[PDB]
Design a protein around this ligand. Structure first.
Ligand SMILES: CP(=O)(O)N[C@@H](CC(=O)O)C(=O)O
Ligand SMILES: CP(=O)(O)N[C@@H](CC(=O)O)C(=O)O
Ligand SMILES: [Zn+2]
Ligand SMILES: [Zn+2]
Lengths: 301, 301
């Protein structure tokens, strides 16, 4: 049974859709309340939000792990590390039964990804059923599921605190910009997610369901010159073609001289986060993913 | 006769198309050289480029005036001030005959403005002729001219150093990103600008011409709180509709609730820089322009 729900906004301070909503919701939350459901809206990175930048000392959505949450409180720590602890204490602790049940973390991307749900665990049948529900509600408005569970990769998100972590990504949108159509898409996504929880809490039964997801394989950097500067850019056939298949023959990058660097490798892939501003400093031009199906067992409260 | 020509990129450090070309052209100018014409590429704000921020201490493209350029040099002064003077000493002095003849200043905008030329002087026959040549040469691809001449508004641009300052602005592109299609557009604009200069220098006579331009009337802020926080955002109809006519009854802003706030007044207007990331701090949702026609007298070298 689902009791404790939060919506985080402003994990990244220059992703204004979430910030705008949460800050309105703090003043009037009617939209995010249901019957017998209390959800708490919350500004994750208030300082980065004030400076309208992604972060102050380091990326908040990467540090919710033992290395960082186990450090001694201290004014000498990076701001985000201090803030990660404050959040763990408020909405976790992480890996405890006292933690929040569900956390929705709201994000924006410059990539042409549309409505996107981040899945941190392939086995969780509750999430697969939620995601199936939202996907289907939204349609024919498309909505895709990025699955980030992986051995060496995968990062400790802000929402990993909860038993049920949910990432909500909407793009394309420039950083520092509030576009109405994106705002609307993110509201519709939440509308359905919260509806599903309520529906489940009034003991509805959901049959088995399948969904298609995109599983991370590896991350590709920009081809780089002899000093570490970018020597080629996202080829225009690849620009804005997130989710769509890319075959070994196909064009990845383009040089100033007009030279085209093709995919190579062995098989088809589905690129994600194509040309995301914030990933330039992470050496990620885009991420390679395989398409695969996940099956959920029926569930009931 | 035109001798000294510069191309500035990186005036704003997170506008990467200019920075990316200029760094390449610094390593191989072939593309921007014309026979009998030497063109110097230059990075105006190398420091803001390092951090991929718009600026360090203040906006570089607003301070090339007497107040700042006449100041005594010291380390208490904002970086950009100290930097502006250093640029005046290399490509000016501004208002002197020893200054460069033409400076092209390269920019990107989040607004959906397409290929855009900034005209600083409505009576400058030479520029008007150049712009008409570029417009004509780019067709059917559109090209738009924004006349920032105004008694009160109008600011001291990096490029105002030259006898003939030219601003090149290409959108939409998110800050901190390199799109190929936007890059290609800026290169073509430059190709044709240099071609024009060369042709003129080889004595070709240019008959009189007319161009449509858009003259700044006034800037419009987002409607705000009692706290000064944004209370409404760019309406979906207005979004991405730069240059297109906006009538008095038409939707302008949108609340979460969401009520539409219409234009008001009684004259039609032409909106420019709709939803520009960098202008949120400047408190400009968009600029209202009136669209008029300018003539050039014929010219010859
Ligand atoms: C480009 P973003 O910061 O909105 N994407 C998230 C992805 C996620 O939510 O896991 C991140 O990089 O932290
Ligand atoms: C969107 P931008 O900052 O590159 N445009 C210039 C306008 C210009 O080039 O005059 C500015 O705001 O100073
Ligand atoms: Zn984010
Ligand atoms: Zn600029």
């Amino acid at each position: 049974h689902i009791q404790k729900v939060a919506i985080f906004g402003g994990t990244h301070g220059n992703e204004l859709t979430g910030v705008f909503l949460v800050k309105h919701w703090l003043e009037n939350g009617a939209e995010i309340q249901r019957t017998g459901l209390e959800v708490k809206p919350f500004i994750t990175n208030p300082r980065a939000v004030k400076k309208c930048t992604r972060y102050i000392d380091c990326d908040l959505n990467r540090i919710f792990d033992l290395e960082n949450l186990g450090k001694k409180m201290s004014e000498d720590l990076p701001y985000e590390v201090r803030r990660a602890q404050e959040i763990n204490h408020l909405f976790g602790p992480k890996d405890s039964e006292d933690s929040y049940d569900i956390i929705f973390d709201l994000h924006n991307t410059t990539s042409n990804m549309g409505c996107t749900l981040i899945l941190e665990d392939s086995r969780n049948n509750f999430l697969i059923q939620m995601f199936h529900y939202i996907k289907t509600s939204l349609a024919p408005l498309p909505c895709y599921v990025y699955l980030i569970e992986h051995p060496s990769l995968k990062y400790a998100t802000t929402r990993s605190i909860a038993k049920y972590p949910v990432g909500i990504e909407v793009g394309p949108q420039p950083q520092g910009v509030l576009r109405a159509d994106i705002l609307d898409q993110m509201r519709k996504m939440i509308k359905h997610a919260l509806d599903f929880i309520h529906h489940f809490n009034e003991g509805e039964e959901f049959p088995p369901c399948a969904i298609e997801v995109y599983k991370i394989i590896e991350k590709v950097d920009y081809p780089r010159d002899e000093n570490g500067e970018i020597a080629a850019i996202i080829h225009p056939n690849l620009q804005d073609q997130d989710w769509k298949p890319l075959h070994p023959g196909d064009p990845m990058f383009l040089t100033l001289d007009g030279k085209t660097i093709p995919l190579g490798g062995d098989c088809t892939v589905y690129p994600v986060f194509v040309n995301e501003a914030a990933y330039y400093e992470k050496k990620e031009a885009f991420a390679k993913t395989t398409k695969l199906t996940l099956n959920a067992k029926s569930i009931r409260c």
